[PDB]
């Protein structure tokens, strides 16, 4: 068809562009950022997402700077990036394409008034925390964890975190904006306006994702930035003055009463260790990866419903173990 040909720096490593060609460019999605397209590489047929952003020639692009540093089985690959052109200049990110997301698959089950089975919950949640461990190890917060940004191949069961459009490297020094994350998955410290929040916001959002996978709908659907807070109180109860200080009247409805009757205790526990008001009292991605809930994935006779083996869950790097390498003994069992 129309066959566009550009000179694209690869995302990985030495800064040396090569010629690259692609053809079936259909528009998908919009936003303050720019536009995302879908397309087909000629060299192989493989489908690609191309996010097209306006770039100030002087200033560096945060997403690209973050994406180039990343190489991890559970995160989208930036395959290439290339510039294009009034006297206006655009960055184009050429990203790996996966046709489904967790939101979409979850939405299938929800419409059948039906459960996503616990095995897929474990698999998906585990791989998520795993991608968080990795990006947190570079001080990078994602700041937009939600099912719509979890790529998923349902045959392999491989989940890959994506959209690093709100991602940012947090630094002890600097303030950062508090209106971020998508509203249902926003951490309570951010509703209270905090500008010194840590990577522990992602963990809350991972918690809101779990909760949702267990319930069939979002756990805290709020009307406004502000109602979001009331929807949390509804469940967590009112936070103590002490808790409120740590972030910077109603009784707490017990977790076990929150979910469906037949729900795993190990899962409900984990949920309560993620959805803590005090951000320091939330598990870290690696502590959660190691949480008892995920024990079924360390059984050597774990198989996927469709027969196949699980994807690789223990090829942990130095880097991913950075934050607490004792845990390697729990996370990596015998085999």
Ligand X SMILES: CC[C@@]1(c2ccccc2)C2=C(CC(C)(C)CC2=O)Nc2n[nH]cc21
Q: Are 240 and 257 in contact (CB under 8 A)?
A: no
**Euclidean distance between the first and final Cα of the chain, in Å?**
49
Residue 297 CB burial class (10 angstroms; 0-12, 13-18, ≥19): middle
- Radius of gyration over alpha carbons of the chain, in Å? 21
| Ligand-binding site membership of 76 (annotated) | no
Q: Which residues of 140-160 are buried (b: 16+ CB within 10 A; e: fewer)?
A: bbbbbbbbebbbbeeeebbbb
Q: Which residues of 70-93 are buried (b: 16+ CB within 10 A; e: fewer)?
A: bebbbbbbbbbbbeeeeeeeebbb
Nearer to ligand X, 90 or 192 (CB): 90
- The closest alpha carbon to 100, from 124, 132, 131, belongs to 124
Task: Report the residue closest to ligand X, judged by CB.
Answer: 49
Catalytic residue (choose from 144, 163, 202, 295): 144
Q: Which two tokens stand for residue 55?
A: 């770039």
Nearer to ligand X, 12 or 248 (CB): 12
Residue 103 C-beta: closest distance to ligand X, Å: 8
Residue 76 C-beta: closest distance to ligand X, Å: 6
| Ligand-binding site membership of 31 (annotated) | yes
71 assigned to active site: no
Residue 202 C-beta: closest distance to ligand X, Å: 17
Nearer to ligand X, 55 or 149 (CB): 149
Residues that bind ligand X (CB under 6 A): 28-29, 36, 38, 49, 76, 95-99, 101, 148-149, 151, 162-163
Nearer to ligand X, 163 or 189 (CB): 163
| Ligand-binding site membership of 226 (annotated) | no
Residue 72 C-beta: closest distance to ligand X, Å: 15
Known binding site: residues? 28-36, 51
Catalytic center residues: 144
């Amino acid at each position: 068809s129309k066959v566009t040909t550009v000179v694209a720096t690869p995302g990985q490593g030495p800064d040396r562009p090569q010629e690259v060609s692609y053809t079936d460019t259909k528009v998908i999605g919009n936003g303050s950022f720019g536009v995302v397209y879908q397309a087909k590489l000629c060299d192989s047929g493989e489908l690609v997402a191309i996010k097209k952003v306006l770039q100030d020639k002087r200033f560096k692009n945060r997403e690209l700077q973050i994406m180039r540093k990343l190489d991890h089985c559970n995160i989208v690959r930036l395959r290439y990036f290339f510039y294009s052109s009034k006297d206006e200049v655009y960055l184009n990110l050429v990203l790996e394409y996966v046709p489904e997301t967790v939101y979409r698959v979850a939405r299938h089950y929800s419409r059948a008034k039906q459960t996503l089975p616990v095995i897929y919950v474990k698999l998906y949640m585990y791989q998520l925390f795993r991608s968080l461990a990795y990006i947190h190890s570079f001080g990078i917060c994602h700041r937009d964890i939600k099912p719509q940004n979890l790529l998923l191949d349902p045959d392999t069961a491989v989940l890959k975190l994506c959209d690093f459009g709100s991602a940012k490297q947090l630094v002890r020094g600097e303030p950062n904006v508090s209106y971020i994350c998508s509203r249902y998955y926003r951490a309570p410290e951010l509703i209270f306006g905090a500008t010194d929040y840590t990577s522990s916001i992602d963990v809350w959002s991972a918690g809101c994702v779990l909760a949702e996978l267990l319930l069939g709908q979002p756990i805290f659907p709020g009307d406004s930035g502000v109602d979001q807070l009331v929807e949390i109180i509804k469940v967590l109860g009112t936070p103590t003055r002490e808790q409120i200080r740590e972030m910077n009247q109603i009784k707490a409805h017990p977790w076990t009463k929150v979910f469906r009757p037949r729900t795993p205790p190990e899962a409900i526990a984990l949920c309560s260790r993620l959805l803590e008001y005090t951000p320091t009292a939330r598990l870290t991605p690696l502590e959660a990866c190691a949480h008892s809930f995920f024990d079924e994935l360390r059984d050597p006779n774990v198989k996927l419903p469709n027969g196949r083996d699980t994807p690789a869950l223990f090829n942990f790097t130095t880097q991913e173990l950075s934050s607490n390498p004792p845990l390697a003994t729990i996370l990596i069992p015998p085999h």
